Design a protein around this nucleic acid. Structure first.
Lengths: 436, 470, 470, 436
RNA sequence: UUUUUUUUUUUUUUUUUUUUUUUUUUUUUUUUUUUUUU
RNA sequence: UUUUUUUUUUUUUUUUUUUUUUUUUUUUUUUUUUUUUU
C-alpha cells in the first residue's frame, strides 16, 4: 500500500512546516525575512549541529574553538528600511531539541533530519564539487558527476544511504582502506570489528545500488579480501569507471527550501488529509505558488541564481542541461559561464553591497524521477577477468542508445499521468555537460 | 603543532651561537675581530670541510695538493693597531669535530650544517652566478634567475633540497645525463642502480617543487624513459623555460652571519625559552640590534657592500629590486653599476690597502617569505564532466564522452613532445606581465609582532629596472 | 621482570580488600559478622551475577523466575545475642557495578573477577564433584581427579583457562560434539564459525596444557577432523585416560576467602609497596595471622570443616593426603569418613540448630606450587639421526633411512587410531607407581623468606590411603 | 704452492704450543696437571672471552652478573697427594691479551682463535646436540646430523665459515627471518643494511657449500625475495631436507687438545722446519705419542670417555660408527648405551668422588678427510618446480650407492700415501647411527 | 692461494623440554542435599 | 513496505590547490677575479 507512506511523509512535512512557523514566531522576523533562504540555511545547520549526537559527544570532551560550549555560528540576516545587517546570534542546542520534540508530537523526527541533510547535500553538489579530495585519493577529476550526496555523513539512515552516489561510496571506502593501510588497524579488537561491520554495510548498499550482474559479482568478490591493501584500490577504481557507464540505480529525493514548507503549512494546506508524495507532482505544484526571496551580490545576477536554486531544489545539477531547459522552458546556462558565486555568504563580506530580490521557480512541465537506470543496459578468479566483460560492454555501449522507453514529460494541468508529450532536440551540440 | 619546531630550531641556533662563543674564546680574537664576516666565512668552510665525510673518505685515499693531511686554508684576519694582517693558520678537522659534539650536547648537528651550507649558497648566488657552466651544458644565459642553491652539493638533506632552485636541479640532472651518454654507465651493476635511485629522488623533489598539474605530469612522463639520451635534454630544457613563468614553489631559508648568532647568544638571549622561527619576524629583529664589521677595498664603497650583505643574508638577490628597496627604505643598486667586488678576499691581495668598516642591516619594514608561487597559470585545464546521471525520467540519450572513456581504460602514445608543448605555449600566451600576485598579504611594520595590520605598497616609478643582472 | 606482575596483583588485591571494607561499612555488620565465610560467598555470587554480562543480556530478554528484574538471592546471616537469623536481602547489580568501578580506581577489575570465580571453582571441587555429568557423557567415574576448575564457565580469560583441568576441557568439548551430532549445527553460518573458533581456542589451550610430544601431536591430528562425529569421542576419551598418567601442566591459583583480604587491607598492610605473589609464601603468611569464623551444623564437627576450608583455599583437594598432612602437621581425613556436609547452607535449613565457631588455618610448613608435571614419560621417543656425514674419506656406503625420508616429504594415512595407542600403551607400561618426582625441590619452614634450605620429607606409614575419594 | 700454507700453520701451532708452555710456567702446575683436558678447556673459554671484542664492548656498557668487571669463571683443578680440588681463580683479559701478543711474535693470532673455537664446536657437537632450538624453530629432530659447528658464533672468519654445517646456517638464517617477521626490522636504516649484508654473506657461503646445480639455483632464487616472510621458511626447510641426501661439501678441521700441542712444542718438535698439515697424517702421528689425563666420575667408565675424546678431536661424531671402529680397530659404542656424561664438570659436583686417569688415542689406521661429497651425487618460477627435481633425485638415490671411489684407508707406517687397503664390512646391521 | 665487525636482558646446577602474557552474546535449567531421577 | 551508533587535532575568509617531515661514499679539478680559455 502507498497511502500509509503518503500519510507518514505528510505528517513529517507538516511537523517541519509547523517548526518553521514557530521559528518565525520566536525570531520576531518580518514576512519578507521569513522568505529568505539564508535564514533557513543557518537554522538548518543549527538543526544538524543539534542532532549530531556523535559530534555532540565528541565536542563535550573537546572544549576548543574558544566560546563553543553549546552554541555555533548563527548569522541571522535582518532588514532595516531596505538595508541589510547580520547578527551573530548564538542559540544553544537543547531548547531547540525540545522545540522539535513538541513540533513532531513527542517524536524525534530523525527522518526529517535525513531529508534536510540530503537537501544540504543537494545544494552542495549543485554549487561546489571537490576534485580536491578526488585527487587527494588520486582519482582523476573526470568523474565529478558521481559526487552526489558526497557531503552526507554516515549518521544518515537507509533513506539517506539511497541517495548517496556511487562515487561518494568509493571515496568513503578508499578513506577507510588508506587508514587501514597507514596503520595496522584491522586487529581483533572492537574497533576493527566495528569498521569491518560498517564496511560490509556500505558494500551491500553498493551492490544494491548497481543493476547488472557482473558488477554485483565483482563487488561480491572484492569482499573476499580480508586484508584491504593496494590491489583493491585499483579494483574499485575500475568499478567506479565501469559505473561511469554502468551507472547505479541511485534515487533523487526532492526536498525543498525550509521556507517553502513553512509557507504552505501556514496557509492551512494540511498534507496528511490530501496525501503527499516525494517523487510525484507534489514538490512541483508547491513551487508553482511559492514566493522566495534571496540575497545577491552587486555583481551577481538573479537570473542564474534562480536556475541554480532550481538545481539545488530538484537535484538536477548532474543531469543533461537540455532536459532541464525543456522542463524550465528557458535555456539553462552551464557552470562554465555562470557569472554568480555560491549561495552561502562568506563571513567577511560587507553588507552595503548586498541586495535582496525574488527567485523564479516556475517550470512549464513536470516529470517523474525514478531510481532506475538507462534502458541502454537492458539493450546490452580475480577482478581482471570480469574487467574483460567490463571492456566488452563498454565497447558495446554507444552514445546513441535512447533510454527511458515508455515514459515522457507531462504537463502541469494533468494530475493522474494521463498523456505525455515526447520531446525532441536537434540543436546540434549546445553542450550536455554542466562542468567544463 | 609549531611549538616543537620552534624549540628545535632555537636549540640548534643556540648551539651554533655557543660554538661561535667558544671559537672566539679559543682564537684569542678581540671584540671587533669577533664581528668580522671573513673570519666566520673561513671558519665555516672549515666546518663543511670537516663534515664532508664523503670528501674526507675520497681525500684519505688521495694524498695530493702537497701539505693536505687533514688541514686546509685558514686565512685568519687580525688587527694590529689599525692595520690588518692575514695568517694561514691550519686547523685539523678532528678536534673541531669533538668541539661540535660538545657544542650540541652530544649530537652531530647536521641540520645546522645544512643551514650554514645553504647560507653559503645564498651568498654565492648573491655575489656570482655561473653562466660558464650554464653554457657548458649549452643552456642559454637568460635563465640566471633559476640558479638558486646552485653551489649546494648533494650531501644536504630534505631541508637543503627544499631551497635548491629548479635550474639547479636541471643542471644536476643534465650532468648525469651527459655522463650516461658519454659512457654506457647504466649497467645492471650497483653504480647504475644507485645513480638511478638518486635520479628518481631528484625527480620527485622536482615534481614536489612545481604547482601546476601539466608540468608535474610531463615530469612524470620524462621518468618513463629508461635510457636518458638526447631527446630528454631538450625535453627538460623546455621544462626549465616553462618554469621560467610557471615557477616552482621553492623555499627561502633565512640564515644569518656566523657572528650575528654568536653575539645574540653571548648576550643571554636564549632562543629555546621564547621560541625561534626561520620565516617570521625573527631574523629581522636580531639584525635590528646587530653590529657587523667587514673588510673593504680602497676602491670599494661600503654603501653597496651593506646592501649586498643584506642580499646574502635574506637571499633576495633574485627578487624584484623595487620590493627590496621598499623594505630597505633606500634604493637598491642593481649589479650593473655596483662599484664593488666579491665579499671574499683573494689569496694574493695585499693588506696595506684593506680597510675595515661597519655594515648597515637595518630595514624599515618586514615581510613573510613563504614557499608559494604567484599568479601565472590561467585558462589551462578545468577537468569537466565525462558522464551524466538521469535526474528526470525522460526518454532521452545519455551523453557519454567515449574517446576519453577509451583513454581511461587504455591509450595510444601521446608522447612528451608535440603534446604538452601546446599547453605550455597556450599558458605562456595567457600569461601577462600585469597579473598582480600574492593577494591578501602585505608588508608589515617593525613595531607589530602578531601580524595585525599591513600597508599596501604601490610603485608608479616608471621602469627603474626590476632585473638584478643586466 | 617480576616486579611489575607483583605490583599489579598487589593493586588488584588491595582493591578487592577495599571493596570488602566498603561492603562491611555499607551492610552495617559487626566485627564478627565481617569474618564469616557465608556472607562473602553470597556477596561473591552477587559479584559474578553482576559481571555475567552474557547472562545479563540473556535474562533481560527472558523475564522469568518471578521477581527477578535485577536482583537474585542474598541470604545475609546476622547475629542477635548469640543466635543467628537469615534475611533475603535483594541487591540490584548496577549500584554494585559502580561501587566496583570506584573500588579499582575507575577500572573494571575483570582479573579479580577471574580469581574469585576460580576460587569458587576451587571450593566446588573441594566439596562436591559431579560424576552425574561425567556419566551423562558416559565417561567412567574413575577420573574424578581431573574435574579441577569444572564449574568455571567460558567467560574467564587466559588466567582462568590456565587452571581448568584436562577433564574439564574434555567435558566441555564433548558437550559441543554431542550438540553438533544431535543437529546439523556446523553450517557455514556465523554460529558454526564461532563455535569452530571456540573449538580451536579450547584445543590449543589443551595442547599447551600437555607436556609430552605424542599427546600434543595426537591432539593436533584430532583437529584435522572437520566433522566431529563419534570416532573423536573415543579418541578424546583415550586422550583423557592417557592424561590420567601423562598429566597436563595445570596451574594452581592460590585464592583466599573474601574476608582474609579485607582484614589484611583494613589493618593497613599495603600490598603494592612490599609486593605480592600468588605462588610464593604470600597466601601462607596472610593466613598465619588471619581469624575466620564459620557456621556449623549441630552434627557437623569443626575439626574436619577447618581442613576442608584449607582444601578450598589452597586447592589441595586433588593432591595426596599424606603431603597435605605433612604441611598441616596433623592428619587430614579423607572424604570417606568426613562427618561434615557442604560449606554452603541449604535455603530450607532452620536456624535454631546453627552454631558459629572459629576455623584453624595455621600450617607448620609452606611449599611452592608450580604448574609443572611429575616423573611419568620414559623410553617413549629419542628422535635419532636419519642421515650421516662423511668425516673420513673412505670408500663406503652412506646409510640413509629411506622409508622415513619418504615420510618427511610425503606420507600415507597413519590415523589417530591403531597408531598413537601403541605409544600411549607402551608409556603406560613403562610407568611405575614408584617413580619419585619433583627432584631438587623440597618443603620449607615458615621462618625462611628467600627459599634457603628445605627439609626432605619421608613417609613409611604403610598404605594410609593417598586417595581423597573412595 | 702448499709449502707456504704448511709453514703458516706450523708457525701458528708453534705459537699456540709456546703459549701453552708459558701458561704451564705461570700457573705453577705439575707435569701431570699440565696434561689435563679440563684446565685447557677452562683456559680456552678464557681465551674466547678475551678475544670476544664484540662481547667485551657489550659487557663494558652492561655491568651485571655481580663481580664481572673483566674476569669470568676459572675453575682450575689441582692435585693434593692423589685427591683433587677446584679453585675459582679469576684472570683478567688484558694481561693474557699481551701474553698472546708476545706469544705470536707481535701478531694477534686470530686464525688460531678460529681453530680453538671450532674445536670447542667440535667437542660440543660430539657431546650434546640441541633439538631444543631445532624444535624452537619448529624443525623436526630428525636432522641432528647437520648440527656441525652449531655453537660457532658469527665472529669467526672464512676458515670458521667453512666447517659450519648446512643445518647451522639454516638455524642462523631462520633466527634472522623470525626476528624480521616479529618486527619491521628491514627499514632503510643502517641496521637493515648490515643485516642484509650478513644475509647475502651467509647465503653465498651456503651456495658455495653445495655441489649440485639445482640446489645452488634454488638458493639463488630464494635471495630474490626482498622481504623474507613465511614462504621462505618452508622453502629453506625443503632446502635442508634436500641437503639431508644432497649434502654440502663441508670441511672437517682437525684440531687437537690444548695440551697435545704444548707437549709437542715443549719436546722441541718445531713444526715450521718439517712442515705441518691440518688434513694429512699430522694430527694422527702427534697423537701416536701423546699422553692425556682426564677426570672421570665414580660411575663413568674411561673406556667410552677415550672414544668420545677421539670423537671430539677428529670431529667424527657425525660419521658412520663402522668406519670409526675400523680406524680405531675397536668397536665404537653409540650414544644410546654410553654410560658416561659430558666431558665438562658441573659447577656443583663434589670432589671426593672425582678420579683422574689416562685416555687412549692410538688408532690402527689413518685416512684423509677431504671436504668433498659422496660419489653418489656424481652417479646421479618458484621453489616448488625445483622441489620436483629434488623429489626425483631423492627417488633416484639409493642406500646402496658406494662413494669415495679411488680412495682408501692407509696404514700408519706409510708417509707418502703409497698403497691403501680396501675395507669391507658384512656385519649385518650393527647400527650406523650415533643418535638413536 | 684464500681471510678479526659492534648495536636496548640469557645460561657451565645436567643428556632431547619448562620457561611478559589477557572481559564475547545467541530460542527453557537449578542453592530444598553427598555419586542418580529426570 | 523498508529504517537515529560514539571512539586520541580540521574549516563557512572563496570556484578545481597549498597545506610534522629528515647525515650516503665510488678511478684527476680550483679561493690568483665579475659572464670564457681550457
Amino acid at each position: 500500500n502507498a497511502t500509509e507512506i503518503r500519510a507518514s511523509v505528510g505528517k513529517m512535512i507538516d511537523g517541519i512546516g509547523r517548526f518553521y512557523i514557530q521559528m518565525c514566531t520566536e525570531l520576531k522576523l518580518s514576512d519578507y525575512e521569513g522568505r529568505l533562504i539564508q535564514n533557513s540555511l543557518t537554522i538548518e545547520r543549527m538543526v544538524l549541529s543539534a542532532f549530531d549526537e556523535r559530534r555532540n559527544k565528541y565536542l563535550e570532551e573537546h572544549p576548543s574553538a574558544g566560546k563553543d560550549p553549546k552554541k555555533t555560528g548563527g548569522p541571522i540576516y535582518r532588514r532595516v528600511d531596505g538595508k541589510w545587517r547580520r547578527e551573530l546570534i548564538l542559540y544553544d542546542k537543547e531548547e531547540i531539541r525540545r522545540i522539535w520534540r513538541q513540533a513532531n508530537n513527542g517524536d524525534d523526527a530523525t527522518a526529517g533530519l535525513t531529508h534536510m541533510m540530503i537537501w544540504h547535500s543537494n545544494l552542495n553538489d549543485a554549487t561546489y564539487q571537490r576534485t580536491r579530495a578526488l585527487v587527494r585519493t588520486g582519482m582523476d577529476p573526470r568523474m565529478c558527476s558521481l559526487m552526489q550526496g558526497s557531503t552526507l555523513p554516515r549518521r544518515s539512515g537507509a533513506a539517506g544511504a539511497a541517495v548517496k552516489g556511487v562515487g561518494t561510496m568509493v571515496m568513503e571506502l578508499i578513506r577507510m582502506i588508506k587508514r587501514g593501510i597507514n596503520d595496522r588497524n584491522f586487529w581483533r579488537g572492537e574497533n576493527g570489528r566495528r569498521t569491518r561491520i560498517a564496511y560490509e554495510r556500505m558494500c551491500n548498499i553498493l551492490k544494491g545500488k548497481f543493476q547488472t550482474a557482473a558488477q554485483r559479482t565483482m563487488v561480491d568478490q572484492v569482499r573476499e579480501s580480508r586484508n584491504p591493501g593496494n590491489a583493491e584500490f585499483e579494483d574499485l577504481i575500475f568499478l567506479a569507471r565501469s559505473a561511469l557507464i554502468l551507472r547505479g540505480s541511485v534515487a533523487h529525493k526532492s526536498c525543498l527550501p525550509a521556507c517553502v514548507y513553512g509557507s504552505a503549512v501556514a496557509s492551512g494546506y494540511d498534507f496528511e488529509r490530501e496525501g503527499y508524495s516525494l517523487v510525484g507532482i507534489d514538490p512541483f505544484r508547491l513551487l508553482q505558488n511559492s514566493q522566495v526571496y534571496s540575497l545577491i551580490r552587486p555583481n551577481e545576477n538573479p537570473a542564474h541564481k534562480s536556475q541554480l536554486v532550481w538545481m539545488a531544489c530538484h537535484s538536477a545539477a548532474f543531469e543533461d542541461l537540455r532536459v532541464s531547459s525543456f522542463i524550465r522552458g528557458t535555456k539553462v546556462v552551464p557552470r562554465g559561464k555562470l557569472s554568480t558565486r555560491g549561495v552561502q555568504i562568506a563571513s567577511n563580506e560587507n553588507m552595503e553591497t548586498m541586495e535582496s530580490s525574488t527567485l523564479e521557480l516556475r517550470s512549464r512541465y513536470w516529470a517523474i524521477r525514478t531510481r532506475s537506470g538507462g534502458n541502454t543496459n537492458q539493450q546490452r578468479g580475480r577482478t581482471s577477468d570480469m574487467r574483460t566483460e567490463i571492456i566488452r560492454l563498454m565497447e558495446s555501449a554507444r552514445p546513441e542508445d535512447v533510454s527511458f522507453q515508455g515514459r515522457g514529460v507531462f504537463e502541469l494541468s494533468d494530475e493522474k499521468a494521463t498523456s505525455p508529450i515526447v520531446p525532441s532536440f536537434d540543436m546540434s551540440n549546445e553542450g550536455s555537460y554542466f562542468f567544463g
